[PDB]
Design a binder for this molecule. Structure first.
Ligand SMILES: OC[C@@H]1O[C@@H](O[C@@H]2[C@H](O)[C@H](O)[C@H](O)O[C@H]2CO)[C@@H](O)[C@@H](O)[C@@H]1O
Ligand SMILES: OC[C@@H]1O[C@@H](O[C@@H]2[C@H](O)[C@H](O)[C@H](O)O[C@H]2CO)[C@@H](O)[C@@H](O)[C@@H]1O
Ligand SMILES: OC[C@@H]1O[C@@H](O[C@@H]2[C@H](O)[C@H](O)[C@H](O)O[C@H]2CO)[C@@H](O)[C@@H](O)[C@@H]1O
Ligand SMILES: OC[C@@H]1O[C@@H](O[C@@H]2[C@H](O)[C@H](O)[C@H](O)O[C@H]2CO)[C@@H](O)[C@@H](O)[C@@H]1O
Ligand SMILES: [Zn+2]
Ligand SMILES: [Zn+2]
Ligand SMILES: [Zn+2]
Ligand SMILES: [Zn+2]
Ligand SMILES: [Zn+2]
Ligand SMILES: [Zn+2]
Ligand SMILES: [Zn+2]
Ligand SMILES: [Zn+2]
Ligand SMILES: [Zn+2]
Ligand SMILES: [Zn+2]
Ligand SMILES: [Zn+2]
Ligand SMILES: [Zn+2]
Ligand SMILES: [Zn+2]
Ligand SMILES: [Zn+2]
Ligand SMILES: [Zn+2]
Ligand SMILES: [Zn+2]
Ligand SMILES: [Zn+2]
Lengths: 302, 304, 302, 301
């Protein structure tokens, strides 16, 4: 069994008080390694998160945006003044959350949760795409249902686009010919009772291709809503089949900025990249900061 | 294999929703059919909305309402339709509407069995029944069984002076008998799903059984572990329709076309009605809970 | 990868309409093999089982009794005119259910469900014992709580008596110094979501000792309340640890009198014995009849 | 280090003649005043069916708080009737696990009020007295399923300090006024794959030392065994744990700690410094009260 190792005992990205769109939280970041650079697309909030009201209240409204950051080394990032993605009004009035970015044939697809704030089920999987990581277009609701924790596979299977999603509480898979209409829905992995992953699970970042399968980092939620990261392996030719699944988490809230924050007891990844035989896993910490942790590819054994 | 299958009559739906009609804005599907007066009489389920089914409870913000529409055809392919549904859910006992009608003619009366859905929880459904003399003036509504239950049809004649009801306490096809079309007794399971097959999660009757010389033709739907709906066939003993004397292993219809694979509920073919015309079985089927198609098989090809 | 084979396509015991106490059902039978004879202690009902009322109602009252039958060949049994155990009033006023009998040293312990009918939770694990399978005494409430599916291990572990029980929906284990007071409660086995054993599980008969561990036949209930038998293997020295568990059931309702009956879709075993290098598994069918199915001991492989 | 029991027998046990303490006496708060041990103990009229989907009227148990006094800390005098019972519907199933803290010249008793309507229908409640006899001013401390609550015996920077237990951690919070709590944070967490893996909660109120605040706590393992552990809080900032012992200081060992209404439980709501010793009173199997001690000089991390 193997574990992620943190590159820092401090966040690598933290809120910026003088930018309203990110003055309270930066977390749950997609990442893509291209042009020998880490391109990070992070969720950012203008406010703390009041989640225990009967409905989302205007007086506690938070708005998520997607910011951009770039790094040579994966640790030190240059950041920018304005977010690169904001929500459309009114269906995404409370913003755009938890992006997962997948490259498929020289196009970049960002899958995110659009949240309208009209009730606590007013969220859905949305998708935009670009050819340059810069000019995002083609917005669509991927599944018109309350759903999230979505990612595209980086290649087609038998000609079909492959979507991971999360009808509560399982990781689901589905297929598409046109990136519009989805079919062959199937549960692929389920929570495990009396474990750290008992309440619900969901995909982390998009799966990483290996020789032995697709690496599926995921998050598991226990009975007290603690988020941890786990890891499984999907079959290479049929990624709807799980062929291995580690019992122990690979990352858990441990540092004080992972245990305490806007949402306590959370580590959460929307993105991970392979650079020089190392997996770099970017993670939100307590829905407040961003950390990064790694594992050598050789140590990934099932 | 040495099996038989339906042949689609057309590669496009024979009925589609109409966006300008609220009551059939998103879906027309799961249709009852009666051949009378040399006309196909089709009674289709229609929905005003998509089907969000993954919530823990039915949510009013995702409410869908099913109505039952009427369409009529001479060739079984091209249908005339109408502005308004012929049956709606009475509010609030059938607040989310009336679903999947099955129509059976017995002694010059027509009996429409449908699922009434109140939407108060996911078990808030029941078999209801209305009847008519003329396929036009439905009346006599009743709850057939006071229990969560659906996939119900009456047999077209009595057996030893008893009415025969097919129903579906999850996950099996059940039979039951009545003297008065009000009280049912001697409930028995007659057919069950088969593990590790296309019909593993649950089964239910399709349309009402069709009388043959060799028995009762029982088209049914089977649901696999991923909730794909396919159609199968079995044969019931002519004198005792509680006994299955044959059952084909492989389905006779399954999602193939894009408008059967993709739709409001992906991967569904579902029949509520099939009729014998000029020694062919015309099987009308909902497709992805969105459109209606028709498939056929020559009566002589039904061999087990 | 292994399954039971029915010895008969008809019940070996059925209700006796002339006997009020066993007029509607005989099922869920404990089994002891002694004196070259099969001893069956079967649940018997005077009535069908209406269960869908807010509370247990006198007009739907059913009474469970425990009858006895004995067989040399395992198929033809000698039966008796009256039951050998009936419920004490008021705590067992609706009778005594699903006995499991374990021989520990030279005493036989029968654990059964006493059902008082005062509420749907008005049931508990009770125990009586005998040295001769004839004179039962020493009645006690094993756990003073709603609980069932109980059996004693046939020997002590580290000087402790071992109890298997079923706080919903798991198979539990507990230990005792004195067969009165129980401690070290532990979940040992849980349902598995999206399978035939998703809703709940419970022990079948008392576990059978093998060289490679304890054979733990159990029942699993799916989302449609279908009851099937499965099989696991517990560690020989620490039976609280499961070392193997077959994925597929070993017995499922298939025959008309297993699928149809007072409670549809049930096969349920309260006893299994080893006879001539074969396991004999007696089972209730549709809570109405008793069947028997076997497996050659050499075919029990995980 | 570890605690040492003073008796291999309970020092308090249920009295079947008294309905309110018919089945159990356990989880007792204590303070030392007037050179007397004042013990405030939870008491139940019934066994504890916990495995139902919701709490059932047919299996209802009612906790009361009783009073007992001792001079040696071992032999206690007891009384016919409880001192606190549930008055209102939020306390329909009674009042549980009191922790008493003296701040300025007043005594505050924080306890769990349990309404029995569902298994989350429990709240941290508080009453207070001048005299340990007349409790007043009942309030819900936090309007949320929470328990294992205690007040610090002093203010920090003029703020009252509350320890609580949003599952599964020990939390701290601050109040200007004992009404509104803010700056909630997690100060200590379970350790997975150990005796304290499933959840932890404060025991009695922390005891002031010169090296910090002594934080006895209970840990719960994967099989629901309750044991006691000990940690040390920074003296000036009790949100900071500066030491924590790996192994328990008390676990079920005697037969009336292993066996009982809730097996495999030792649990303390109360401990006091008396003659250079910590006296740790504990419930055992949620059925009896025992007491164990440690020489304060022996407390080393
Ligand atoms: O998309 C909105 C989203 O909701 C939150 O997720 C969960 C949800 O609101 C509910 O409260 C559930 O029981 O717990 C929350 C997570 O465990 C967060 O993901 C939040 O950041 C988002 O706005
Ligand atoms: O009668 C309501 C009915 O429910 C749906 O049926 C199924 C049910 O909701 C459950 O979710 C099952 O597992 O999946 C659905 C179909 O498999 C639909 O039939 C729906 O159209 C109806 O309103
Ligand atoms: O001990 C009474 C016992 O109850 C039944 O078990 C279950 C129970 O009544 C409840 O309805 C639950 O939801 O499902 C039942 C079985 O799945 C039977 O075991 C019955 O025969 C017994 O009297
Ligand atoms: O305040 C009610 C309280 O509940 C019990 O606590 C726990 C709870 O019911 C739940 O079942 C948990 O998993 O285990 C119980 C103890 O670990 C007891 O503390 C009980 O005495 C109280 O009444
Ligand atoms: Zn700026
Ligand atoms: Zn959107
Ligand atoms: Zn699931
Ligand atoms: Zn998630
Ligand atoms: Zn772990
Ligand atoms: Zn029109
Ligand atoms: Zn109706
Ligand atoms: Zn059906
Ligand atoms: Zn095909
Ligand atoms: Zn007789
Ligand atoms: Zn009893
Ligand atoms: Zn469980
Ligand atoms: Zn059971
Ligand atoms: Zn299977
Ligand atoms: Zn007295
Ligand atoms: Zn209160
Ligand atoms: Zn606690």
């Amino acid at each position: 069994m193997f574990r992620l190792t943190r590159l820092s005992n401090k966040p690598i990205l933290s809120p910026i008080k003088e930018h309203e769109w990110e003055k309270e939280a930066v977390f749950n970041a997609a990442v893509i390694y291209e042009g020998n650079k880490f391109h990070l697309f992070y969720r950012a909030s203008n406010n703390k998160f009041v989640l225990n009201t009967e409905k989302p209240e205007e007086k506690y409204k938070f708005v998520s945006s997607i910011g951009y950051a770039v790094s040579e080394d994966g640790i030190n990032f240059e950041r920018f003044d304005k977010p690169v993605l904001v929500g459309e009004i009114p269906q995404e009035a409370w913003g755009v959350e938890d992006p997962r970015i997948t490259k498929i044939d020289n196009k970049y697809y960002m899958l995110y949760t659009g949240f309208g704030g009209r009730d606590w089920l007013d969220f859905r999987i949305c998708m935009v795409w670009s050819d340059d990581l810069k000019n995002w277009k083609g917005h669509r609701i991927v599944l018109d249902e309350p759903n999230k924790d979505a990612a595209l596979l980086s290649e087609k299977i038998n000609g079909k686009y492959v979507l991971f999603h999360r009808r509560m509480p399982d990781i689901w898979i589905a297929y598409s010919d046109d990136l519009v209409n989805w079919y062959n829905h199937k549960i692929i992995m389920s929570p495990k009772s009396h474990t750290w992953e008992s309440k619900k699970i969901g995909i982390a970042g998009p799966p990483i291709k290996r020789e032995d399968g697709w690496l599926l980092i995921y998050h598991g939620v226990d009975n007290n809503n603690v988020y941890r990261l786990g890891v499984a392996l999907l079959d290479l030719k049929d990624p709807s089949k799980v062929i291995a699944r580690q019992k122990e988490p690979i990352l858990e809230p441990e540092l004080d900025w992972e245990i305490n924050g806007l949402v306590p007891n959370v580590v959460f990844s929307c993105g991970a990249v392979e650079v020089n035989d190392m997996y770099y896993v970017y993670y939100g910490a307590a829905d407040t900061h961003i950390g990064v942790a790694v594992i050598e590819k050789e140590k990934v054994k099932f």
